[PDB]
Design an enzyme around this catalytic site. Structure first.
Site, PDB file in Angstrom:
ATOM      1  N   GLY A 293      50.488 -22.579 -19.063  1.00  0.00           N
ATOM      2  CA  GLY A 293      50.712 -21.523 -18.973  1.00  0.00           C
ATOM      3  C   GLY A 293      49.790 -21.239 -18.321  1.00  0.00           C
ATOM      4  N   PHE A 294      49.365 -21.463 -16.909  1.00  0.00           N
ATOM      5  CA  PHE A 294      47.960 -21.353 -15.842  1.00  0.00           C
ATOM      6  C   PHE A 294      48.106 -22.580 -15.098  1.00  0.00           C
ATOM      7  CE2 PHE A 294      47.160 -18.736 -19.591  1.00  0.00           C
ATOM      8  CZ  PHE A 294      47.352 -17.290 -19.343  1.00  0.00           C
TER       9      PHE A 294
ATOM     10  N   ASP B 250      48.315 -30.332 -20.024  1.00  0.00           N
ATOM     11  CA  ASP B 250      47.265 -29.337 -20.420  1.00  0.00           C
ATOM     12  C   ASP B 250      49.107 -28.146 -20.517  1.00  0.00           C
ATOM     13  OD1 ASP B 250      48.706 -29.702 -17.347  1.00  0.00           O
ATOM     14  OD2 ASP B 250      48.587 -26.659 -18.415  1.00  0.00           O
ATOM     15  N   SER B 251      48.139 -27.149 -21.070  1.00  0.00           N
ATOM     16  CA  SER B 251      49.221 -26.190 -22.221  1.00  0.00           C
ATOM     17  C   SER B 251      50.771 -25.742 -21.340  1.00  0.00           C
ATOM     18  CB  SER B 251      48.552 -25.210 -22.968  1.00  0.00           C
ATOM     19  OG  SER B 251      48.197 -23.863 -21.848  1.00  0.00           O
TER      20      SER B 251
ATOM     21  N   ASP C  66      45.374 -21.220 -23.729  1.00  0.00           N
ATOM     22  CA  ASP C  66      44.587 -20.471 -23.581  1.00  0.00           C
ATOM     23  C   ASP C  66      45.254 -19.369 -22.934  1.00  0.00           C
ATOM     24  OD1 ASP C  66      44.905 -21.731 -21.561  1.00  0.00           O
ATOM     25  OD2 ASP C  66      42.773 -22.022 -21.030  1.00  0.00           O
TER      26      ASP C  66
ATOM     27  N   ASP D  45      38.610 -33.416 -13.760  1.00  0.00           N
ATOM     28  CA  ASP D  45      39.940 -33.544 -13.331  1.00  0.00           C
ATOM     29  C   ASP D  45      39.893 -32.727 -11.797  1.00  0.00           C
ATOM     30  OD1 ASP D  45      41.199 -31.125 -13.024  1.00  0.00           O
ATOM     31  OD2 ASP D  45      41.062 -31.243 -15.080  1.00  0.00           O
TER      32      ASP D  45
ATOM     33  N   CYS E  95      40.860 -50.051   1.766  1.00  0.00           N
ATOM     34  CA  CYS E  95      39.801 -50.883   2.532  1.00  0.00           C
ATOM     35  C   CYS E  95      39.992 -52.676   2.725  1.00  0.00           C
ATOM     36  CB  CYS E  95      38.240 -50.166   2.006  1.00  0.00           C
ATOM     37  SG  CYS E  95      38.791 -48.860   2.281  1.00  0.00           S
TER      38      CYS E  95
ATOM     39  N   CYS F 288      39.214 -51.053  -2.316  1.00  0.00           N
ATOM     40  CA  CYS F 288      40.373 -50.758  -2.533  1.00  0.00           C
ATOM     41  C   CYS F 288      41.455 -51.734  -1.726  1.00  0.00           C
ATOM     42  CB  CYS F 288      40.707 -49.115  -2.042  1.00  0.00           C
ATOM     43  SG  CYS F 288      40.765 -48.602  -0.048  1.00  0.00           S
TER      44      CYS F 288
ATOM     45  N   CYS G 219      34.078 -51.576  -0.190  1.00  0.00           N
ATOM     46  CA  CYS G 219      35.443 -50.752  -0.998  1.00  0.00           C
ATOM     47  C   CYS G 219      35.973 -52.144  -1.235  1.00  0.00           C
ATOM     48  CB  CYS G 219      35.914 -49.002   0.059  1.00  0.00           C
ATOM     49  SG  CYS G 219      37.076 -48.661  -1.391  1.00  0.00           S
TER      50      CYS G 219
HETATM   51 ZN   LIG Z   1      39.119 -48.099   0.448  1.00  0.00          ZN
END
Ligand SMILES: [Zn+2]
Ligand SMILES: [Zn+2]
Lengths: 364, 383
Positions: free
Chosen positions: B97-98, B94-95, B148, B266, B303, B300, B298
């Site tokens: 800025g914020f 991102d920029s 922005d 995001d 799991c 992952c 899952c």
């Molecule tokens: Zn998992």
């Protein structure tokens, strides 16, 4: 089955086989774990480390408070923590966080994990082992004598009483039939009691011996150590607890000790440091000199940290307290420490251990 | 016209759902895509190999935090963010800025740029649009965002900030000398004001930037206003360029916003594990002796290896370790969700996927969130 390849200058080079398809090299170390995990490492990241030992150390102090859940689970702690095919030795205490002293009696021993005291009589200890079902386990023992001949005499008798009572309960336990009790040599710093502990424990049918109470490491205790191992049979492995720094490891190997805890690389990691000592001393990655240092921790190291990351990145991760710093340092520090043990065995094969010892000492 | 970085590989016939590909310098990214923050994964001990193995091909960097530690000069010496952090895939910044900047650290915005305060009445720091581009050039990210004028807010400030964001967009475009190496996105403003957002859409799309983000949502606004502003935005953003909806990451929000035409998303510890029925709160006592994984299907690492019981024990007794395992699984869930969304669009079965997702997450149509039923109905998807 322990089979020696050779013995040179009191140093035992060999393998422990039928563990019943597994083998463990000696001299060697055990993988250090806390609450059933290698610290900061996963199954996946452990697989990448080179030279991981064939047996991992679990600590009763970190697992005993999970007795209820493990007993409900029934299949043992290795399966519970997701390592169903690994070999496990369960020690009584954690060498880094051993808890308060003074709670040993002739009837029980106490350990502390995250929460409250867990007081273990012999029957409670064996009940816990029936839930854990480790491959090897340290017997309930009194290790606080050197923490007075009277106090040291009691540590031998208490430990022999615990040993006989635990062996009797193992005979009646279906599940512990495939587990191996490790006898524990006590006696503190009284020579007469050390020998009596050594001789009497060797009369019992234990699978091996733990040398307890040698933590530091004086030359007096090193002489007690060699006096003890001279009384133990040659065909059983000798473990020692609380001895993990490379120089101390070498002194104990010269005196007939085979297996060591690997908590030292963990201690290095926790202070933000990386092992750098040559084995064919450490650096503090928080130092500002590493902020722009784009070298790996150790040039030529094959670990995932050094092959793919810089000192500068690890410095940054430490300064922002990111867990990835501990992951990468732990991978490197274990890899370095296991490589050191590989070099010991190679030096024994080549009859150059004396030269390796001076290389290590030089960097101390 | 500049070369387009996106192509569409499939479109839903009824709804606005798009399956696409972004040709970025560190590899092609399939869309729709959820983009985790890389430094949030590293904070929880996740390595590059682990995040790659979950399927992540683009992650966010927070420019403000990167600009504090290690700072842009060090990142430049390290040959960019990719080199510094050993990340071989795409990065979006991102920029600066914020995003993740405390209001305690911000003075009022002026035409020259954003002003940061230093502790205890110290001197202020200016971040101009030009300096924002220069910093992101040093980071070397594959997608960079304009500076922005962000507002949370009613009254003239919304219109004022929207028009300043247009002017700053032009300054970022002029400062960005290497569009062959990094892709600058504009950020649509206008808040919840349909007229201001329409003007911002109409004016910003006159600039030939390679992509457009949708800013100023995910505030306190109602869900009714939220989805209507998303749909307004996608109705006016070019079809042949990506649409990045910022700050939207709950699974239901993601699915509905894909149906409305969004391509990139995001969104930023309590023991919660994401599952198709919502979440499991693994600290609850009912999981102490539950020996199943979080989700048997899952893929992952958590799991494949660990039970709910083990994670429950670690949440109490070794919390840092538990948080690694849960973060891995939760990122995996987000990536798997978006992968499943994209497969359904390619197989022309996205409306069926939505119906199954909603039925699993909520049950009968009368238990689904009203805003979501209405938003999906507006693109022809009935539950
Ligand atoms: Zn998992
Ligand atoms: Zn290394």
């Amino acid at each position: 089955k322990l089979s020696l390849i050779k013995v040179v200058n009191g140093c035992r080079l060999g393998k422990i086989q039928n563990l019943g398809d597994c083998t463990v090299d000696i001299p060697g170390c055990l993988l250090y774990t806390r609450t059933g995990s290698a610290p900061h490492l996963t199954h996946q990241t452990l697989r990448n480390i080179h030279g991981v030992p064939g047996i991992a150390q679990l600590t009763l102090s970190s697992l005993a408070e999970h007795h209820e859940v493990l007993a409900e689970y029934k299949k043992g702690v290795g399966s519970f923590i997701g390592m169903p095919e690994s070999l496990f030795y369960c020690s009584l205490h954690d060498p880094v966080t051993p808890g308060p002293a003074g709670y040993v009696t002739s009837k029980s021993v106490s350990v502390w994990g995250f929460g409250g005291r867990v007081e273990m009589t012999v029957s409670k200890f064996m009940a816990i082992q029936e839930a854990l079902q480790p491959d090897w386990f340290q017997c309930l023992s009194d290790g606080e004598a050197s923490c007075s001949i009277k106090r040291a005499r009691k540590s031998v008798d208490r430990s022999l009483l615990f040993l006989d009572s635990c062996l009797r309960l193992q005979e009646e336990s279906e599940v512990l039939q495939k587990s191996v009790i490790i006898g524990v040599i006590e006696g503190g710093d009284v020579m007469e009691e050390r020998l009596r502990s050594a001789r009497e424990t060797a009369k019992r049918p234990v699978g091996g011996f733990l040398l307890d109470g040698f933590q530091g490491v004086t030359e007096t205790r090193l002489h007690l150590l060699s006096s003890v191992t001279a009384e133990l049979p040659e065909d059983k492995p000798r473990l020692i607890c609380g001895v993990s720094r490379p120089d101390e490891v070498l002194e104990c190997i010269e005196r007939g000790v085979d297996l060591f805890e690997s908590f030292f690389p963990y201690q290095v990691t926790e202070r933000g440091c990386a092992l750098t000592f040559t084995f064919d001393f450490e650096i503090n990655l928080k130092e500002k000199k590493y902020q722009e240092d784009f070298d790996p921790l150790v040039r030529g190291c094959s670990c995932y940290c050094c092959k793919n990351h810089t000192r500068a990145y690890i410095h940054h991760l430490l300064m922002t307290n990111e867990l990835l710093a501990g992951v990468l340092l732990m991978m490197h520090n274990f890899e370095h420490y296991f490589g050191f043990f590989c070099s010991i065995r190679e030096a024994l094969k080549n009859d150059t251990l004396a030269q390796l010892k001076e290389l290590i000492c030089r960097q101390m | 016209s500049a070369p387009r970085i996106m192509r569409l590989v499939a479109e839903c016939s009824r709804s606005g759902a798009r399956a696409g590909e972004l040709r970025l310098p560190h590899g092609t990214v399939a869309t729709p895509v959820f983009m985790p923050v890389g430094t949030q994964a590293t904070m929880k001990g996740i390595t590059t190999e682990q995040l790659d193995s979950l399927g992540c091909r683009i992650c966010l960097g927070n420019t403000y935090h990167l600009g504090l530690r290690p700072g842009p000069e060090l990142i430049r010496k390290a040959q960019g963010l990719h080199g510094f952090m050993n990340w071989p895939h795409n990065l979006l910044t991102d920029s600066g800025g914020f995003q993740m900047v405390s209001l305690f650290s911000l003075s009022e915005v002026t035409e020259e740029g954003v002003h940061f305060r230093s502790p205890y009445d110290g001197e202020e720091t200016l971040l101009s649009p030009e300096r924002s581009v220069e910093i992101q050039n040093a980071l070397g990210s594959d997608i960079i965002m304009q500076l922005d004028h962000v507002v949370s807010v009613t009254g003239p400030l919304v219109e004022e900030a929207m028009h300043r964001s247009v002017r700053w967009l032009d300054r970022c475009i002029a400062a960005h000398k290497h569009p062959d190496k990094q892709n600058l996105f504009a950020i649509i403003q206008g808040g919840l004001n349909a007229d201001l957002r329409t003007t911002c859409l109409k004016e910003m799309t006159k600039r030939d930037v390679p992509g457009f983000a949708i800013g100023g949502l995910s505030g306190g606004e109602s869900k009714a206003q939220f989805w209507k502003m998303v749909a307004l935005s996608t109705s006016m953003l070019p079809k042949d360029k990506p649409r990045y909806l910022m700050g939207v990451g709950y699974a239901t929000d993601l699915v509905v916003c894909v149906a409305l035409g969004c391509d990139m998303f995001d969104c930023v510890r309590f023991g919660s594990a994401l599952v198709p029925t919502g979440n499991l709160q693994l600290k609850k006592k009912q999981y102490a002796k539950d020996f199943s994984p979080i989700n048997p299907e899952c893929p992952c690492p958590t799991c494949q290896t660990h039970s709910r019981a083990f994670l429950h024990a670690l949440l109490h007794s070794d919390n840092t370790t538990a948080l690694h395992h849960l973060t891995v699984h939760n990122i995996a869930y987000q990536l798997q969700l978006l992968s499943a969304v994209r497969s359904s669009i390619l197989e022309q079965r996205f409306p069926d996927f939505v119906r199954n997702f909603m039925r699993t997450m909520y049950g009968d149509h009368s238990l689904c969130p009203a805003w979501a039923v209405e938003a999906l109905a507006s693109v022809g998807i009935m539950l």
